[PDB]
Amino acid sequence: DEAEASKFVEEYDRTSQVVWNEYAGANWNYNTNITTETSKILLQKNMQIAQHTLKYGTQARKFDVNQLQNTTIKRIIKKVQDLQRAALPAQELEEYNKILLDMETTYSVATVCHPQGSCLQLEPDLTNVMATSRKYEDLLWAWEGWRDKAGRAILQFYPKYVELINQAARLNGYVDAGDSWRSMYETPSLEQDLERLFQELQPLYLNLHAYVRRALHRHYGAQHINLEGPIPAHLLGNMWAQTWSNIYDLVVPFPSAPSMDTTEAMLKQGWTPRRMFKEADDFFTSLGLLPVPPEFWQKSMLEKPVVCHASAWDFYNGKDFRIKQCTTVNLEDLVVAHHEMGHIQYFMQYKDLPVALREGANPGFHEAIGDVLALSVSTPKHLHSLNLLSGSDEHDINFLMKMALDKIAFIPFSYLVDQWRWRVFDGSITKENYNQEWWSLRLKYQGLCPPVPRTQGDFDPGAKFHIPSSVPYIRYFVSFIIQFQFHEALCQAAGHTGPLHKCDIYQSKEAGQRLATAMKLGFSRPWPEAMQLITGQPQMSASAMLSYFKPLLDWLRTENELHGEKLGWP
Ligand SMILES: *[C@@H]1O[C@H](CO[C@@H]2O[C@@H](C)[C@@H](O)[C@@H](O)[C@@H]2O)[C@@H](O[C@@H]2O[C@H](CO)[C@@H](O)[C@H](O)[C@H]2NC(C)=O)[C@H](O)[C@H]1NC(C)=O
Ligand SMILES: CC(=O)N[C@H]1[C@H](O[C@H]2[C@H](O)[C@@H](CO)OC[C@H]2O)O[C@H](CO)[C@@H](O)[C@@H]1O
Ligand SMILES: O=C(O)c1cn(C2CC2)c2cc(N3CCNCC3)c(F)cc2c1=O
Ligand SMILES: O=C(O)c1cn(C2CC2)c2cc(N3CCNCC3)c(F)cc2c1=O
Ligand SMILES: C[C@H](NC(=O)O)C(=O)O
Ligand SMILES: [Cl-]
Ligand SMILES: [Cl-]
Ligand SMILES: [Zn+2]
C-alpha cells in the first residue's frame, strides 16, 4: 500500500538523520582526537547504528517493491533493504567492526625507523622522501620499509575481513562483496564498459611509460633500468607509483622553458593550509556554487594538530560539513584540497534530499567534482594569476607532460586495485596468492616491477590506505575518465575555444550551473541522466581525455620513435 510505504520512508528519514549524525560525531572524534574514551564512544555508536539499520531494514524487507508505484519511495525502500554489516549475527558484526578498526589503526600508526635514528611516518616523512629523493637506495629504504611495517602487519587481519564482508554481502542478496560494490553503479555492463575505457588509454599510457623509462635510464643508470622491461616501482616519485608528477624534473621535455617551482612560491608568499581551502572555496563561489558554511571553518581539521588521509565529512543534518586533512603547503596538496572541497560541494547541493538519496549519481561522480576545478587551477595561466608563476608550444608540451604524469599514469593503477579485490572477494585469489596476484596486475596494467623480490608474509596491498580502510577504488578510475568529460563540457559552456588544455573555467557562472543541476539530483536518478545534463550525452567516454592530451600523444609518439623505443614489456 502506497500510503504505508510513504509513511515508512518519512520515519526512516527522521530517525536516520538523528542516528547517523550521532555516529558521524563519534567517528570524527576518534579520527581526529584518538583517545581510549573516543574509541569507546565510537564502539557504542557502532551498536546504535547497527540496531537502527537492522530495525528499519527488517521493516523495509516486508514491502514488495515489485508492487510499488511511486519510484522514489520504491528506490529508497530498495536501498534500506540492504542492511550491509547489520545483517550479520551479533558475534560476527562485533568481530567485523573490530577488524576494520584494527586494520585502519595499524595502517595509520605504522612507522619506519632507522636504527639509533628517527622513525618516519607515511605523512609527511616517507611521502617527502618518495617525492624528492633521487637516490636508488634511499627510495628503496622508504618503499620497502613502508611495506615491511604497514603491509606485513595488515596481513593477519585480511582473510577474516574478506570472510566477513562477503558473509554480509551474501546475507543482503549479493554473491560476494565485489558484487555488492559493483552494484553501486547500477550498470550491468560495468566490467566491459570499464575494460573498453582502459583499452582506449593504452596508447597514451604505453608512450608515457616508454618516455619516462628512457629518462629513468638516463638518471638511474643502464644497469638499473631495462629499456624493454617494467619500471622499478620505487622510482616514480610516489609511494604506490600511482601518480608520477614528482619526477617531472627528470623528464622535462623542454628544459629551456622556465617554470617556477610553486612550492617555493607558496611557502615564501605565506600560503597556509587555511589559505589553500579559502582559494578552493573561492573558486567554487566564482562559478556561482555554494560557499562552505561558517561552521566548516570552525570544526574542520585542516592540518595535523590522527588518521591523516584527506577526507570530507557529512554529518547528516544539512548544516555541518568538515574536511579532515594533514595539509602540507604545496601544489599537490592544493589539488587534494580542491578534491575534498568538491565532496563538500556535493554534500551541500543534495542536502535537502531524503538521506537514502544523499550520495553522488555514482561514486565516480562524487570523486570527480573537485578534480574538475583543479584542472583549471593547475593551468599555467591560473598559477600566474595566483602569483605562483611568472606562450610557446614548448611550454604547452611541458604542461601537458606534467598533467599526464598524474592523470594518465593514474589510469592503470586506479583500474587494477579493484580488479585485485574483486578476485579476492569472488574467491579466485586465495590468501596464499594475494601478493603474487597483486604483482601480476602491477606488471600487466602499470608495467612495474618490485625492486626487491617479495617474500613469504608480504602483503603489499595492505600498504595502500584503501585496502585496510575498505574503501572501494574503481570510483577513482571512473573519476579520472569523467572529470575530462565534465571539463570539456564546462569549457564549452564557458565559451572556451581552441585547445581544451588551455581552458580555465574560473568565474564562469554557466559552467557552475551545469554542475549544480546534476549534483542536486544526488542518487535520485540513474547516473546516465546526470551525465547527460552535464555533457549532452549519457555515456562514460575517454574521448575528452584523449582530446586534452592529443598534442602530447603526438609529441610522445615522435620522440619515442626517434629513440627506437619498444613500447610495453614482456
Ligand atoms: C513520488 O514521491 C516523491 C516523494 O514525495 C515526498 O516524500 C513522500 C515520502 C511524502 O513525504 C511526500 O509528501 C513528499 O512529497 C514525490 O516527490 C516530491 O514532489 C514534491 C512536489 O510534488 C517536491 O516538492 C519534492 O521535492 C519531491 N521530492 C522528491 C523527488 O524526493 C514525487 O513527486 C512522487 N511522484 C509523483 C509525481 O506522484
Ligand atoms: C533541510 C530540510 O528541511 N530539508 C528536508 C526536505 O524537505 C523539503 C524542503 O523543505 C524543501 C526546501 O528546503 O526542498 C524540498 C524538500 O526536500 O525533506 C527531506 C525528506 O524528503 C529531508 O530529508 C530534508 O532534510
Ligand atoms: O551497522 C550497519 O549496518 C552499518 C554500520 N556502519 C557503521 C558506522 C560504521 C556503516 C558505516 C558506513 N560508512 C561510514 C562512512 N564512510 C564509509 C561508509 C556505511 F556505508 C554503512 C554502515 C552500515 O551499514
Ligand atoms: O557517514 C556515515 O557515518 C554513514 C554513511 N552512510 C552512507 C553510505 C554513505 C551510511 C549508510 C548506511 N546504510 C545502511 C544500509 N542501507 C542503507 C545504507 C548506514 F547504516 C550507515 C551509514 C553511516 O553511518
Ligand atoms: C585517488 C585517491 N584519492 C583519495 O583517496 O582521496 C588516492 O589517494 O589513492
Ligand atoms: Cl605495491
Ligand atoms: Cl566505487
Ligand atoms: Zn574523494
Residue numbers in the entry: 40 to 344, 350 to 434, 438 to 617
Reproduce passages from the article:
Angiotensin I-converting enzyme (ACE, EC 3.4.15.1) is a membrane-bound, zinc- and chloride-dependent peptidyl dipeptidase that catalyzes the conversion of the inactive decapeptide angiotensin I (Ang I) to the vasoconstrictor octapeptide angiotensin II (Ang II) by removing a carboxy-terminal dipeptide. It consists of two homologous catalytically active zinc binding centers on each N- and C-domain, referred to as nACE and cACE, respectively, with significant differences in their physiological functions. As previously shown, the overall structure of cACE is ellipsoidal, composed of two lobes, referred to as subdomains 1 and 2. At the core of the molecule is the active site composed of the HEXXH motif residues, His383, His387, and Glu411, that coordinate the catalytic zinc ion.
The Cip–cACE complex structure was refined at 1.85 Å resolution with good reliability index values (R-factors) and geometry. In the present structure, both a malonate ion (coordinating the zinc) and an N-carboxyalanine molecule (bound to the S1′ subsite) are bound to the active site. A large piece of positive difference map electron density was noted ∼16.7 Å opposite to the zinc binding site of the nonprimed region, which could readily be modeled as two antiparallel face-to-face π–π stacked Cip molecules. The two Cip molecules (Cip1 and Cip2) are sandwiched between Trp59 and Arg124 in a π–π–π–cation stacking interaction. Cip1 forms additional interactions with Thr92 and Asp121, via hydrogen bonding, and Asp358 and Asn66 via a water-mediated interaction. Cip2 forms additional interactions with Leu122 and Ala125 via hydrogen bonding, Asn85 and Asn136 via a water-mediated interaction, and hydrophobic contacts with Ile88 and Tyr62. The electron density of the lid region between residues 71 and 87, and higher B-factors, is indicative of a dual conformation between the closed and “partially open” state, likely influenced by the occupancy of the ligand; however, the quality of the electron density does not confer the accurate modeling of both conformations. The location of Cip binding between the lid region and subdomain 2 may therefore restrict the ability of the lid region to open and close fully in order for large substrates to bind. An allosteric inhibitor binding to this region would therefore potentially restrict the correct positioning of the downstream C-terminal residues of Ang I for efficient cleavage at the active site or provide an additional barrier for its binding, thus reducing the rate of catalysis.
